[PDB]
């Protein structure tokens, strides 16, 4: 069912971490945070396992919320698949937030790349 070098349950919890972050966005949106999780498993400045991204501490709702282990929104699964086989639409983000609610003062600190949907993805 899951792509080579992931495992069921790596597929679902990403499917459960986006859905968390981007239920509701344009599906552009809901590929892109998959992106991210992607980019910060390459990254040197995050872990390098799609479960240690996922689960830094304050990283995805979905932690918190108690929704990682559900069977995942059927959209949001299909975002992960799609990110998965190359789609990234932010042009290599590793951070994002939604301008209008977001309380942390450092995040406008980051190279901003592109805003989709509610998201502004950054460097
Ligand atoms: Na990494």
Same mark, same amino acid.
């Given at each position: 069912?899951?792509?080579?070098?992931?495992?069921?349950?790596?597929?679902?919890?990403?499917? *459960?971490? =986006?859905? +968390?972050?981007?239920?509701?966005?344009?599906?552009?949106?809901? %590929? @892109?945070?998959?992106?991210?999780? !992607?980019?910060?498993?390459?990254?040197?400045?995050?872990? *390098?396992? =799609?479960? +240690?991204?996922?689960?830094?501490?304050?990283?995805?709702?979905? %932690? @918190?919320?108690?929704?990682?282990? !559900?069977?995942?929104?059927?959209?949001?699964?299909?975002?992960?698949?799609?990110?998965?086989?190359?789609?990234?639409?932010?042009?290599?983000?590793?951070?994002?937030?939604?301008?209008?609610?977001?309380?942390?003062?450092?995040?406008?600190?980051?190279?901003?790349?592109?805003?989709?949907?509610?998201?502004?993805?950054?460097?």
């Amino acid at each position: 069912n899951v792509p080579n070098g992931y495992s069921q349950n790596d597929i679902q919890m990403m499917a *459960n971490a =986006v859905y +968390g972050e981007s239920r509701g966005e344009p599906y552009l949106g809901q %590929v @892109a945070v998959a992106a991210v999780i !992607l980019n910060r498993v390459t990254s040197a400045s995050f872990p *390098n396992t =799609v479960s +240690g991204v996922i689960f830094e501490p304050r990283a995805f709702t979905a %932690v @918190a919320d108690g929704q990682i282990y !559900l069977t995942p929104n059927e959209t949001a699964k299909k975002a992960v698949l799609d990110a998965i086989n190359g789609w990234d639409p932010t042009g290599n983000a590793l951070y994002y937030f939604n301008p209008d609610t977001a309380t942390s003062k450092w995040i406008w600190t980051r190279p901003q790349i592109k805003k989709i949907g509610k998201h502004i993805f950054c460097k």
